[PDB]
Amino acid sequence: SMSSAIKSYKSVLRPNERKNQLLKSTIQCLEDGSAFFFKMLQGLFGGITPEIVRFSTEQEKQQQDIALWCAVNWFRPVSQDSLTHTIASDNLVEKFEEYYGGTASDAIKQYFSASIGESYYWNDCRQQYYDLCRELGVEVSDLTHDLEILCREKCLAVATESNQNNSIISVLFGTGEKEDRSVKLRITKKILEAISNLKEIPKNVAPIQEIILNVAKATKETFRQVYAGNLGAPSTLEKFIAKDGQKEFDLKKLQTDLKKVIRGKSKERDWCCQEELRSYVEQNTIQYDLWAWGEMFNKAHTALKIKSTRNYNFAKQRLEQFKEIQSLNNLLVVKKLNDFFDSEFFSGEETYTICVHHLGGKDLSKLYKAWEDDPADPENAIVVLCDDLKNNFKKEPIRNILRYIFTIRQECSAQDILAAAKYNQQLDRYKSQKANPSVLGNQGFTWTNAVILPEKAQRNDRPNSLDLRIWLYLKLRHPDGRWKKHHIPFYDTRFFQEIYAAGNSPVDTCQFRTPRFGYHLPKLTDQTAIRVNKKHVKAAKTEARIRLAIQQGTLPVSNLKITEISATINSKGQVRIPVKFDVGRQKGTLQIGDRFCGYDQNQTASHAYSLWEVVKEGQYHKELGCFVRFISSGDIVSITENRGNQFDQLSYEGLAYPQYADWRKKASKFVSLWQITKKNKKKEIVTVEAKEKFDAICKYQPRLYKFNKEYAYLLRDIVRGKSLVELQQIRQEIFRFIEQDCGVTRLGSLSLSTLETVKAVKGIIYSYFSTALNASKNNPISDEQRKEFDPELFALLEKLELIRTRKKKQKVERIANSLIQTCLENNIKFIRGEGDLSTTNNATKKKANSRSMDWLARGVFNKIRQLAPMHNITLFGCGSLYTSHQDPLVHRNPDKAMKCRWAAIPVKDIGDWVLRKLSQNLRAKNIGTGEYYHQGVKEFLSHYELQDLEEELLKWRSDRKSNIPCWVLQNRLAEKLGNKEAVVYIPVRGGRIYFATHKVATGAVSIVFDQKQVWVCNADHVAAANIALTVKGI
RNA sequence: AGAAAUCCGUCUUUCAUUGACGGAACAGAGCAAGCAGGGUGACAUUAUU
DNA sequence: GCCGCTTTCTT
DNA sequence: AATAATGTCACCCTGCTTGCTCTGTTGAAAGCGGC
DNA sequence: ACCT
Ligand SMILES: [Mg+2]
Ligand SMILES: [Mg+2]
Ligand SMILES: [Mg+2]
């Protein structure tokens, strides 16, 4: 079938005063009718029955909890604006049972027992339904009968059966002739009859078309008139009659569609309360208008259905969580675990929830073993495990909690202790968990056929200024209630460029006139002569280029064949323009010649991509079950130029050290004048001269943006113990750093490091405000106070955060663009990406969590997911586990194959940290990836013939005076490699080098290491290859 | 149908009226975390009496 | 053919 | 032993800040009468 | 496990 995607444009409307008033009144009208339908539909959904739900969910393959669907429609947490019949949560269960005829299910119990925010209140929508029946002056059974018709006609969304657009307005309040349903039902039933018992199932549809025409007593030219009275969109049966006749016949499918029609049309639409309901709606809104009532209904109905569905799923989830909690609730082990706070191993003012990560997690087991194996030295076992654990990502255990656990290890096993910690976390999260309130929301309203078509646009073009206006033609409601259409303009140079400007190209047709869709605008020259206001130049430039393209006759004509464009408008005048377009036919599974890629997301280094082809002959891959060939690997990059020099906006690290001496000098003059205040001995004040820290920062010659982050921290430290006078002087320095020369307000790339730098600068200003206003636990400060004290610098807080927000949005867009453009250029139809990456969690260090917040792994994946189907490129998510260590084309071909990662360190640069890592890795044989790094250390010693060192290398702990020095390893390696500048391969986690069996990374070179031929590859390119080769779902 | 308008943004000790460039959007609810001060509380290294 | 309205469509 | 420097780790608070998921929307396709 |  033909796949499609959606692009869109967003601007603000510019109506004159009179039309602005009309638009304001029309939107207010639509909004008030929306609130009315919201309350009325809340009432009507309060009125559904178990048997309506049963009928709507009946063909569902998984059985639905009908009682729970009833519940999520009968009782809703709601806002004060729709609260009509307050119910205490106490009574929820009881009242539900009264309505349901039986005991409330456990999932329903979880839904009722869940928390709600303070501005929300439980509302009994079934009582609201009864009172609505009274207001309408109809019997309850009558309105319920009409509700059954509505839910059968798909006019309302019930459970898993979605609504049929806005059809409710036409079906219930429409003024026109309707279908002859009995005719369609008879014809459909006999057609299913006739095709039920065929003694020869034809391969083509011609005999079946014969049968249908004979039953319907019509010809191919009269079937529509006979069957549907020439009314409505063509049915499946009409289009079956329309088919060629040599086309193949799917008997199963025709029977399925005919059964659908018999099921949906067996009961007629005989309303009981139609005219009451129409009078009610019209009195509470405006005189009947299909479009306007449709918009009101759409807003209200969407708002209600999304929350009912979410609460259904949430209640099921909550029941599962509750059963998991009550399962591992070992009363005694939990109680003694928490008795840690009531024991003298804790002297804190307050307690806190004990979690798995506070215990070391699984490794608590190991610790118990130590205690079994060497009692009466428990402190050393604790210290050894803690040192072995320490990870730059995971949060370290609480030493006293482990100390107290030793006390009770005879009574409480390791597994029961970790079960108890898991129970603590799960119960806490279960208790704060909140049900979802039904609220109208602030969605806008859509006018259909609102944009004047580009080829019909009124254009007041000048020789040097194209008419840049796009006009909507909208029906608006006047004070007398009359609807009239008015022209309202808006500007969008991107919508102008991509679609709306009048193309004149003799030979070119494209979908969107922008580079990623294959079109580039002409270059501006010395003849361009742009003379506009300063605040329009960029827009002017785009206009100029389009003008040039029209003058050259090279502006492509849009091939989208747009016949109507709709516009969605809100109360603030903003307009949204959706454009749907076809992207090609749906792809089949991998053929030979199909190309696919994978991408690896990195933080400090570039995202990597790896490009592969399915081949007829070549290297076989089991998991793909095909032959594959490596095309190429690379770094994801987004270059822009400054007078010929290139910059990767994604990775640029700013000026090298020697190139910003002046800037550094200025910072230097400041720090020589100041000192850091510190008072954590007693209340006595300790002074250190800031230059000490500044020299330390400048010692290892960082590049510009790292330097700026480090200097931001320094400034914050300088600001900490000062007085107001001092702060006034310091305020002058803070402004110079932020605003001039190399400050984040003029320089900084889209790199993660730059975002962290801007965050550190915000930290400076935050510390300024905290110290100035004497902040404390008993004296919290607010934004009101901060703004009153120093409005300008408080404004800089928001400005810096907006800078970060804009950087991050632009960055996500640019990463997706670079990868998609790589795919288009290398004819890639499939992308694999890690859909698995961590966001943030209590078990992770706050520094790593903050970095991950600025990393935006999920956002990047979502953006690639958004852009890929716009070029018929499929994106698959895959689990990220072990993708950095698998050996490409060897792992799962046929067996599991993994290796450590390596770094290329010059021998002179081999410091005590290398020994730390080497020692740790060697004495680190364990489950998971440690085994591969222990193996890598083994191979390292073998290759460099340093095995004699292994022994003492294993006794290496940090700070031991009898540790082997760096000069030892450096001198052996320089003995063997000849000099001090030759590289040494070291196994280190996160290293950028992978020793691959195969040449699976562009630019790899083969060496022999530990008597093994192996390709020295970029580790992230290896990871991208691993991701590309994965087939398993996430 | 009313000549005005950066649609929204990015890079650069380069800030550009011919510099180089990028983007489907929107609503509500929910969840997860971060920071600046301030408190608590454990450990570890130095360097001494 | 267009506009503005109706209806049904099982995608 | 014991004091005090400097660093690590964690746990809490007030009042702000952020990213991510969920469940949805931005209709399709035909005829009619009046232009 | 990703992430260094
Ligand atoms: Mg990865
Ligand atoms: Mg700038
Ligand atoms: Mg990687």
Residue numbers in the entry: 0 to 1033
Reported in the publication:
Two Cas12i (Cas12i1 and Cas12i2) proteins have crRNA-guided dsDNA cleavage activity. In addition to the double-strand DNA (dsDNA) cleavage activity, Cas12i2 cleaves ssDNA in trans upon crRNA forming heteroduplex with the complementary ssDNA, as well as processes the pre-crRNA to form the mature crRNA. The Cas12i2 consists of the recognition (REC) and nuclease (NUC) lobes connected by the wedge (WED) domain. The RuvC domain is the sole DNase catalytic domain in Cas12i2, with catalytic residues Asp599, Glu833, and Asp1019 lining the active pocket.
In the DNA-bound Cas12i2 ternary complexes, a 5-nt ssDNA, which was probably introduced with the target DNA, is observed in the RuvC catalytic pocket. In addition, the ssDNA bound in the catalytic pocket remains intact may due to the high concentration of the complex and the chemicals used for crystallization, suggesting that our DNA-bound Cas12i2 complex is in the substrate binding state. The phosphate group between the 2nd and the 3rd nucleotides is located in the catalytic pocket, indicating that this is the cleavage position. In the Cas12i2wt–crRNA–DNA ternary complex, a pair of Mg2+ cations (A and B), separated by 4.0 Å, are located on either side of the scissile phosphate between nucleotides 2 and 3. Both metal ions coordinate the scissile phosphate group and RuvC domain catalytic residues. Mg2+A coordinates the side chains of Asp599, Asp1019, and Asn601, while Mg2+B coordinates with the side chains of Glu833 and Asp599. One water coordinating Mg2+A is positioned 3.9 Å away from the scissile phosphate, and is located approximately in line with the scissile phosphate and the leaving oxygen atom, suggesting this water acts as the nucleophile that attacks the phosphorus of the scissile phosphate. Mg2+B coordinates the 3′ oxygen atom leaving group, indicating the cleavage products contain 5′-phosphate and 3′-OH groups. Thus the two Mg ions facilitate DNA hydrolysis with Mg2+A coordinating and activating the water nucleophile, and Mg2+B stabilizes the leaving group. However, no metal ions were observed in these AacCas12b structures. Our Cas12i2wt–crRNA–DNA ternary complex with two metal ions bound in the RuvC catalytic pocket represents a substrate binding state of the catalytic pocket.
